[PDB]
Amino acid sequence: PPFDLDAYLARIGYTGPRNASLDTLKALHFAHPQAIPWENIDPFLGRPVRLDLAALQDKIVLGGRGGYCFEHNLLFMHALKALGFEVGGLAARVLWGQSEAITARSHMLLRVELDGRTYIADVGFGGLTLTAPLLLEPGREQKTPHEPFRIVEADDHFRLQAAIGGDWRSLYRFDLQPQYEVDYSVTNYFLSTSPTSHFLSSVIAARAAPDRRYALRGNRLSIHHLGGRTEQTEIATAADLADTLQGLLGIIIPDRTAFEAKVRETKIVE
């Protein structure tokens, strides 16, 4: 089908100018991850994740659900293309929370060419969602609506890093090789279905807000206040987990019974 830009902008609550400016890119990059949560509900429930434009719009834009990295950034790319931006897909190997080896190119991000300069954009990283586009300028410290970020060079590739707890912490590493939807479909198949993929076995969710970030992993809820404390709470029951997801985090669980059942079966909570 075509992309319904009005419907997407409605989903994310964007009523600003429709053009291919840096101002617009910034506004969209902030609004999207506040409106659409990061979640792995479908992979966890063993439901297929479809990346074609029709299915993304129906799941996320019309159906009011969220998704993980490919869903977020494919949708975001479609929207930016509709607005007249020059945008391409990239891939990355995740470094955040891993152990120091080479991980699979399991993450999607975007490249945006704007007023003669290269930016990256990424509204789909689960560990810490970026809320502004970043100039691809190695070393430079860049303010965002949340944490500062920087891109550094390493060998013949780049790392994206965030300033967290007074340290520069690597999120992921990438090069500028272009990626297409077909490339993402292979990785998506692996992450959504492989017995080795943790996206099948854990509940992982996040949503940005103006002054904070909510992050959930299993029965642990973290609320990170901007330039402030992080509240940590342990979620006691499968029912409470579902309630936290659906209330606080704005996540829709299509089959709550099967969800709670799996949470109990797999011992995610007590």
- Can you spell out the DSSP letters for 29-43? HHHHHHHS-EE-HHH
| 3-state SS, residue 229 | coil
Last residue of a domain, one of 180, 196, 212: 180
Beta-strand ranges (E) seen in the chain are: 38-39, 86-94, 107-114, 117-121, 134-135, 141-142, 149-154, 157-164, 167-174, 204-209, 212-217, 220-225, 230-234
The residues that are catalytic are 69, 107, 122
The CA distance from 139 to 132, in Å, is 17
Q: Residue 156 phi/psi, 5° resolution? A: -100, 25
Do residues 11 and 61 touch, judged by C-beta distance below 8 A?
Answer: yes
The CA distance from 209 to 225, in Å, is 9
The CA distance from 95 to 127, in Å, is 10
In the annotated binding site for CoA, the residues are 69, 96, 125, 127, 147, 224
Same domain? For 123 and 10 the reply is no
Same domain? For 56 and 162 the reply is no
Same domain? For 131 and 156 the reply is yes
Q: Which residue has the tokens 């790392």?
A: 159
In the annotated binding site, the residues are 69, 96, 125, 127, 147, 224
Same domain? For 199 and 257 the reply is yes
The CA distance from 131 to 32, in Å, is 8
Same domain? For 202 and 159 the reply is no
Task: Tell me whether residue 240 is exposed, middle or buried, using C-beta atoms within 10 angstroms of its C-beta: 0 to 12, 13 to 18, 19 or more.
Answer: middle
Bridging pattern class, strands 117-121 and 134-135: antiparallel
The CA distance from 217 to 225, in Å, is 17
CATH of the domain at 166: 2.40.128.150
Last residue of a domain, one of 150, 180, 210: 180
Total domain count, the chain: 2
Tokens (6 digits) for 118: 């290269």
Q: How was this structure determined?
A: X-ray
Q: Indicate the resolution in Å.
A: 1.8
Same domain? For 185 and 155 the reply is no
What one-character-per-residue DSSP string does 87-150 give? Answer: EEEEEEEE-TT----PPP--EEEEEEEETTEEEEE-S--SSS---S-EE--TT-EE--SSS-EE
Same domain? For 237 and 203 the reply is yes
Same domain? For 92 and 117 the reply is yes
Same domain? For 66 and 97 the reply is no
CATH of the domain at 216: 3.30.2140.10
Angle at 133 between CA 221 and CA 248, to 5 degrees: 20
Breaks (C-N over 2.5 A) in the chain follow: 100
The CA distance from 267 to 49, in Å, is 24
Same domain? For 113 and 218 the reply is no
Domain that holds residue 146: 85-180
Last residue of a domain, one of 124, 152, 180: 180
Residue in 77, 161, 87 with CA at minimum distance from that of residue 119: 87
Q: Residue 121 phi/psi, 5° resolution? A: -140, 145
b/e string for 124-160 if b means 16 or more Cβ within 10 A?
bbbbbbbbbbbebeeeeeeebebbebbbeeeeeebbb
Neighbours of 104 (CB within 10 A): 15
Tokens (6 digits) for 158: 């780049």
Residue type, 253: I
Do residues 250 and 207 touch, judged by C-beta distance below 8 A?
Answer: yes
Same domain? For 93 and 139 the reply is yes
Same domain? For 57 and 103 the reply is no
Task: Tell me whether residue 210 is exposed, middle or buried, using C-beta atoms within 10 angstroms of its C-beta: 0 to 12, 13 to 18, 19 or more.
Answer: exposed
Tokens (6 digits) for 237: 């029951």
From the centroid of its chain, how far is CA 103?
Answer: 18
